[PDB]
Every structure is written in structure tokens, then in C-alpha cells.
Amino acid sequence: GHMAEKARDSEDRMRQFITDASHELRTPLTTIRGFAELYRQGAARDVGMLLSRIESEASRMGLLVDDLLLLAKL
Amino acid sequence: GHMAEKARDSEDRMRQFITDASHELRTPLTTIRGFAELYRQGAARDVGMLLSRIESEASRMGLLVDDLLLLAKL
Ligand SMILES: [K+]
């Protein structure tokens, strides 16, 4: 009973963390992918701003990933 | 007992996957920012290749993120 229920609680918190953590990664990515696809469709007048925003989200994502890497040890 | 053992083994496998996914995301993020910098500095030609490389890295990152989401549900 008790060890299984605590282990299951611990495992469920790990699932929910991975779900939240991954959706958080999803949002910068969808921007990176969308802005690159806008370019391939012919729609970019200013690839400088497009690239800047891409770079911004890549950096944001990099901070999320380093924090995951650390949190996975805890 | 056996029920805690499997909750824990399941949790530990999820933990290892976070780690491995997070490392695998770190690299495309590095590629995108390294290539962006080279292009901004005048060191490369064919911005269409830059944007297509970013699209490919982003789609690979999307696959890793969806793996995490699926693993959390299974
Ligand atoms: K933990």
C-alpha cells in the first residue's frame, strides 16, 4: 500500500512535470518553425527581424533546456 | 514491494529520457545560433539555406518534444 502509493504519487508528479515542461518548449518552437515557414512561402520582406525573433526564442528555449537538465538530477 | 519498484523504475526511465531529450535539443539550438551569427557577420551565402537549416532543426526539436509528451502519457 503505502510505498506503492507514494511511489505512484512520485511517478505522477514526474509525468505531469514532463508534460508541463514539454508544452513550455512547444511555444518558442512553434514560433521558430512558423517564422521559418513564412520565409519559405515567399512572405518575408525583412529576414533580419524574422531571424532576430527566431534567435530570441532559441535563446529562451536554451534557458528552459538547461533548467530541465539541472532539474532532472533533483 | 513490486508496485513501488515499477512506479520507481518508470520514474527513473522518465528521468533519463528528460536528460537525453534535453541534450538532443541543446545541439539544434546551438546550431541555429551559430549559423545565425555566421550569416549576420557576412561570413556566409544563401540565406535560403540558413532558413531551411533552421526549419529542419526546428522540426527535429518538435519530434523530440512530442516524444516527451507521449512518454508522459504512456
Ligand atoms: K524530482
PDB file of N, CA and C in Angstrom, chain B residues 12-67:
ATOM      1  N   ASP B  12      12.320   6.630 -13.031  1.00  0.00           N
ATOM      2  CA  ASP B  12      13.741   6.664 -13.402  1.00  0.00           C
ATOM      3  C   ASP B  12      14.016   6.625 -14.902  1.00  0.00           C
ATOM      4  N   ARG B  13      13.240   5.837 -15.636  1.00  0.00           N
ATOM      5  CA  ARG B  13      13.274   5.860 -17.082  1.00  0.00           C
ATOM      6  C   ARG B  13      12.820   7.226 -17.658  1.00  0.00           C
ATOM      7  N   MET B  14      11.766   7.799 -17.073  1.00  0.00           N
ATOM      8  CA  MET B  14      11.302   9.135 -17.479  1.00  0.00           C
ATOM      9  C   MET B  14      12.377  10.185 -17.227  1.00  0.00           C
ATOM     10  N   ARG B  15      13.045  10.072 -16.092  1.00  0.00           N
ATOM     11  CA  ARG B  15      14.121  10.964 -15.737  1.00  0.00           C
ATOM     12  C   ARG B  15      15.284  10.928 -16.738  1.00  0.00           C
ATOM     13  N   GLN B  16      15.706   9.724 -17.098  1.00  0.00           N
ATOM     14  CA  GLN B  16      16.761   9.500 -18.134  1.00  0.00           C
ATOM     15  C   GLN B  16      16.367  10.062 -19.493  1.00  0.00           C
ATOM     16  N   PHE B  17      15.095   9.908 -19.876  1.00  0.00           N
ATOM     17  CA  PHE B  17      14.568  10.449 -21.118  1.00  0.00           C
ATOM     18  C   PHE B  17      14.568  11.969 -21.159  1.00  0.00           C
ATOM     19  N   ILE B  18      14.223  12.613 -20.048  1.00  0.00           N
ATOM     20  CA  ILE B  18      14.265  14.062 -19.967  1.00  0.00           C
ATOM     21  C   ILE B  18      15.657  14.479 -20.296  1.00  0.00           C
ATOM     22  N   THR B  19      16.620  13.859 -19.620  1.00  0.00           N
ATOM     23  CA  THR B  19      18.030  14.186 -19.768  1.00  0.00           C
ATOM     24  C   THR B  19      18.495  14.073 -21.208  1.00  0.00           C
ATOM     25  N   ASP B  20      18.190  12.946 -21.825  1.00  0.00           N
ATOM     26  CA  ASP B  20      18.633  12.653 -23.182  1.00  0.00           C
ATOM     27  C   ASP B  20      17.975  13.548 -24.244  1.00  0.00           C
ATOM     28  N   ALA B  21      16.676  13.767 -24.096  1.00  0.00           N
ATOM     29  CA  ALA B  21      15.911  14.716 -24.926  1.00  0.00           C
ATOM     30  C   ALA B  21      16.451  16.136 -24.782  1.00  0.00           C
ATOM     31  N   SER B  22      16.654  16.582 -23.543  1.00  0.00           N
ATOM     32  CA  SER B  22      17.166  17.895 -23.292  1.00  0.00           C
ATOM     33  C   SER B  22      18.553  18.089 -23.930  1.00  0.00           C
ATOM     34  N   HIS B  23      19.450  17.111 -23.790  1.00  0.00           N
ATOM     35  CA  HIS B  23      20.733  17.182 -24.536  1.00  0.00           C
ATOM     36  C   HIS B  23      20.573  17.246 -26.033  1.00  0.00           C
ATOM     37  N   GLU B  24      19.670  16.441 -26.567  1.00  0.00           N
ATOM     38  CA  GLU B  24      19.372  16.393 -28.018  1.00  0.00           C
ATOM     39  C   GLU B  24      18.731  17.678 -28.538  1.00  0.00           C
ATOM     40  N   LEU B  25      18.067  18.450 -27.673  1.00  0.00           N
ATOM     41  CA  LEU B  25      17.522  19.743 -28.033  1.00  0.00           C
ATOM     42  C   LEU B  25      18.595  20.826 -27.963  1.00  0.00           C
ATOM     43  N   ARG B  26      19.516  20.684 -27.036  1.00  0.00           N
ATOM     44  CA  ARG B  26      20.567  21.665 -26.874  1.00  0.00           C
ATOM     45  C   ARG B  26      21.408  21.850 -28.130  1.00  0.00           C
ATOM     46  N   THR B  27      21.717  20.773 -28.810  1.00  0.00           N
ATOM     47  CA  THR B  27      22.500  20.836 -30.028  1.00  0.00           C
ATOM     48  C   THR B  27      21.892  21.639 -31.267  1.00  0.00           C
ATOM     49  N   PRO B  28      20.675  21.291 -31.756  1.00  0.00           N
ATOM     50  CA  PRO B  28      19.989  22.124 -32.742  1.00  0.00           C
ATOM     51  C   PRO B  28      19.898  23.604 -32.322  1.00  0.00           C
ATOM     52  N   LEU B  29      19.685  23.873 -31.029  1.00  0.00           N
ATOM     53  CA  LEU B  29      19.665  25.247 -30.536  1.00  0.00           C
ATOM     54  C   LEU B  29      21.001  25.970 -30.738  1.00  0.00           C
ATOM     55  N   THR B  30      22.064  25.258 -30.403  1.00  0.00           N
ATOM     56  CA  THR B  30      23.455  25.669 -30.739  1.00  0.00           C
ATOM     57  C   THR B  30      23.737  25.854 -32.223  1.00  0.00           C
ATOM     58  N   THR B  31      23.292  24.902 -33.047  1.00  0.00           N
ATOM     59  CA  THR B  31      23.424  25.016 -34.491  1.00  0.00           C
ATOM     60  C   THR B  31      22.741  26.320 -34.991  1.00  0.00           C
ATOM     61  N   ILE B  32      21.543  26.622 -34.481  1.00  0.00           N
ATOM     62  CA  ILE B  32      20.711  27.688 -35.058  1.00  0.00           C
ATOM     63  C   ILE B  32      21.393  29.029 -34.745  1.00  0.00           C
ATOM     64  N   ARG B  33      21.883  29.150 -33.514  1.00  0.00           N
ATOM     65  CA  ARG B  33      22.516  30.352 -33.049  1.00  0.00           C
ATOM     66  C   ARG B  33      23.900  30.562 -33.609  1.00  0.00           C
ATOM     67  N   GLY B  34      24.642  29.478 -33.805  1.00  0.00           N
ATOM     68  CA  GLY B  34      25.943  29.540 -34.503  1.00  0.00           C
ATOM     69  C   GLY B  34      25.829  29.926 -35.973  1.00  0.00           C
ATOM     70  N   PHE B  35      24.894  29.283 -36.683  1.00  0.00           N
ATOM     71  CA  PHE B  35      24.620  29.634 -38.103  1.00  0.00           C
ATOM     72  C   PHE B  35      24.084  31.059 -38.222  1.00  0.00           C
ATOM     73  N   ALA B  36      23.116  31.458 -37.374  1.00  0.00           N
ATOM     74  CA  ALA B  36      22.617  32.815 -37.427  1.00  0.00           C
ATOM     75  C   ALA B  36      23.756  33.837 -37.291  1.00  0.00           C
ATOM     76  N   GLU B  37      24.657  33.618 -36.319  1.00  0.00           N
ATOM     77  CA  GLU B  37      25.763  34.552 -36.107  1.00  0.00           C
ATOM     78  C   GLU B  37      26.685  34.646 -37.332  1.00  0.00           C
ATOM     79  N   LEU B  38      27.025  33.513 -37.929  1.00  0.00           N
ATOM     80  CA  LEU B  38      27.873  33.473 -39.120  1.00  0.00           C
ATOM     81  C   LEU B  38      27.283  34.291 -40.259  1.00  0.00           C
ATOM     82  N   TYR B  39      25.987  34.095 -40.497  1.00  0.00           N
ATOM     83  CA  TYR B  39      25.254  34.826 -41.536  1.00  0.00           C
ATOM     84  C   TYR B  39      25.167  36.340 -41.243  1.00  0.00           C
ATOM     85  N   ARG B  40      24.878  36.707 -40.021  1.00  0.00           N
ATOM     86  CA  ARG B  40      24.850  38.105 -39.641  1.00  0.00           C
ATOM     87  C   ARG B  40      26.211  38.785 -39.842  1.00  0.00           C
ATOM     88  N   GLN B  41      27.284  38.056 -39.619  1.00  0.00           N
ATOM     89  CA  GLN B  41      28.630  38.600 -39.734  1.00  0.00           C
ATOM     90  C   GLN B  41      29.168  38.696 -41.153  1.00  0.00           C
ATOM     91  N   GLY B  42      28.401  38.260 -42.153  1.00  0.00           N
ATOM     92  CA  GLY B  42      28.843  38.356 -43.554  1.00  0.00           C
ATOM     93  C   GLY B  42      29.701  37.210 -44.025  1.00  0.00           C
ATOM     94  N   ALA B  43      29.780  36.157 -43.209  1.00  0.00           N
ATOM     95  CA  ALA B  43      30.666  35.033 -43.467  1.00  0.00           C
ATOM     96  C   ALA B  43      30.076  33.970 -44.357  1.00  0.00           C
ATOM     97  N   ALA B  44      28.793  34.047 -44.691  1.00  0.00           N
ATOM     98  CA  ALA B  44      28.164  33.005 -45.496  1.00  0.00           C
ATOM     99  C   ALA B  44      27.189  33.542 -46.563  1.00  0.00           C
ATOM    100  N   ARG B  45      26.896  32.660 -47.510  1.00  0.00           N
ATOM    101  CA  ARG B  45      25.994  32.947 -48.585  1.00  0.00           C
ATOM    102  C   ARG B  45      24.825  31.983 -48.544  1.00  0.00           C
ATOM    103  N   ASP B  46      23.744  32.450 -49.155  1.00  0.00           N
ATOM    104  CA  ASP B  46      22.495  31.694 -49.329  1.00  0.00           C
ATOM    105  C   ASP B  46      21.655  31.609 -48.091  1.00  0.00           C
ATOM    106  N   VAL B  47      20.965  32.702 -47.845  1.00  0.00           N
ATOM    107  CA  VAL B  47      20.118  32.847 -46.659  1.00  0.00           C
ATOM    108  C   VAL B  47      18.977  31.833 -46.654  1.00  0.00           C
ATOM    109  N   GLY B  48      18.552  31.412 -47.844  1.00  0.00           N
ATOM    110  CA  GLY B  48      17.592  30.332 -48.012  1.00  0.00           C
ATOM    111  C   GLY B  48      18.057  29.035 -47.401  1.00  0.00           C
ATOM    112  N   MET B  49      19.347  28.733 -47.490  1.00  0.00           N
ATOM    113  CA  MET B  49      19.938  27.587 -46.779  1.00  0.00           C
ATOM    114  C   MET B  49      19.944  27.761 -45.247  1.00  0.00           C
ATOM    115  N   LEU B  50      20.247  28.970 -44.776  1.00  0.00           N
ATOM    116  CA  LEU B  50      20.172  29.253 -43.350  1.00  0.00           C
ATOM    117  C   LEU B  50      18.756  28.962 -42.861  1.00  0.00           C
ATOM    118  N   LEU B  51      17.762  29.515 -43.541  1.00  0.00           N
ATOM    119  CA  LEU B  51      16.368  29.378 -43.078  1.00  0.00           C
ATOM    120  C   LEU B  51      15.879  27.957 -43.173  1.00  0.00           C
ATOM    121  N   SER B  52      16.289  27.228 -44.220  1.00  0.00           N
ATOM    122  CA  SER B  52      15.956  25.810 -44.361  1.00  0.00           C
ATOM    123  C   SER B  52      16.645  24.916 -43.325  1.00  0.00           C
ATOM    124  N   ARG B  53      17.862  25.228 -42.929  1.00  0.00           N
ATOM    125  CA  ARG B  53      18.531  24.522 -41.849  1.00  0.00           C
ATOM    126  C   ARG B  53      17.794  24.724 -40.516  1.00  0.00           C
ATOM    127  N   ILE B  54      17.334  25.940 -40.267  1.00  0.00           N
ATOM    128  CA  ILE B  54      16.594  26.303 -39.033  1.00  0.00           C
ATOM    129  C   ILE B  54      15.253  25.536 -38.997  1.00  0.00           C
ATOM    130  N   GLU B  55      14.570  25.504 -40.137  1.00  0.00           N
ATOM    131  CA  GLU B  55      13.315  24.715 -40.295  1.00  0.00           C
ATOM    132  C   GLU B  55      13.552  23.263 -39.981  1.00  0.00           C
ATOM    133  N   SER B  56      14.614  22.657 -40.524  1.00  0.00           N
ATOM    134  CA  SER B  56      14.962  21.246 -40.220  1.00  0.00           C
ATOM    135  C   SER B  56      15.306  20.951 -38.771  1.00  0.00           C
ATOM    136  N   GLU B  57      16.125  21.795 -38.176  1.00  0.00           N
ATOM    137  CA  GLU B  57      16.420  21.696 -36.748  1.00  0.00           C
ATOM    138  C   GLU B  57      15.135  21.843 -35.886  1.00  0.00           C
ATOM    139  N   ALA B  58      14.282  22.798 -36.256  1.00  0.00           N
ATOM    140  CA  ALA B  58      13.041  23.041 -35.513  1.00  0.00           C
ATOM    141  C   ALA B  58      12.081  21.860 -35.578  1.00  0.00           C
ATOM    142  N   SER B  59      11.981  21.229 -36.751  1.00  0.00           N
ATOM    143  CA  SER B  59      11.130  20.037 -36.918  1.00  0.00           C
ATOM    144  C   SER B  59      11.691  18.856 -36.144  1.00  0.00           C
ATOM    145  N   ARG B  60      13.011  18.728 -36.081  1.00  0.00           N
ATOM    146  CA  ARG B  60      13.615  17.681 -35.233  1.00  0.00           C
ATOM    147  C   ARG B  60      13.350  17.948 -33.738  1.00  0.00           C
ATOM    148  N   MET B  61      13.479  19.202 -33.336  1.00  0.00           N
ATOM    149  CA  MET B  61      13.141  19.547 -31.958  1.00  0.00           C
ATOM    150  C   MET B  61      11.658  19.237 -31.673  1.00  0.00           C
ATOM    151  N   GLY B  62      10.764  19.601 -32.594  1.00  0.00           N
ATOM    152  CA  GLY B  62       9.328  19.243 -32.443  1.00  0.00           C
ATOM    153  C   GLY B  62       9.074  17.769 -32.238  1.00  0.00           C
ATOM    154  N   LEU B  63       9.838  16.934 -32.928  1.00  0.00           N
ATOM    155  CA  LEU B  63       9.705  15.480 -32.718  1.00  0.00           C
ATOM    156  C   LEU B  63      10.137  15.039 -31.362  1.00  0.00           C
ATOM    157  N   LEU B  64      11.242  15.564 -30.884  1.00  0.00           N
ATOM    158  CA  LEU B  64      11.697  15.247 -29.519  1.00  0.00           C
ATOM    159  C   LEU B  64      10.696  15.698 -28.430  1.00  0.00           C
ATOM    160  N   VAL B  65      10.147  16.886 -28.593  1.00  0.00           N
ATOM    161  CA  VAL B  65       9.183  17.452 -27.630  1.00  0.00           C
ATOM    162  C   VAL B  65       7.915  16.611 -27.597  1.00  0.00           C
ATOM    163  N   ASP B  66       7.403  16.207 -28.760  1.00  0.00           N
ATOM    164  CA  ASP B  66       6.237  15.308 -28.813  1.00  0.00           C
ATOM    165  C   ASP B  66       6.518  13.909 -28.258  1.00  0.00           C
ATOM    166  N   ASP B  67       7.752  13.394 -28.408  1.00  0.00           N
ATOM    167  CA  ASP B  67       8.129  12.161 -27.720  1.00  0.00           C
ATOM    168  C   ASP B  67       7.993  12.271 -26.198  1.00  0.00           C
TER     169      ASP B  67
END
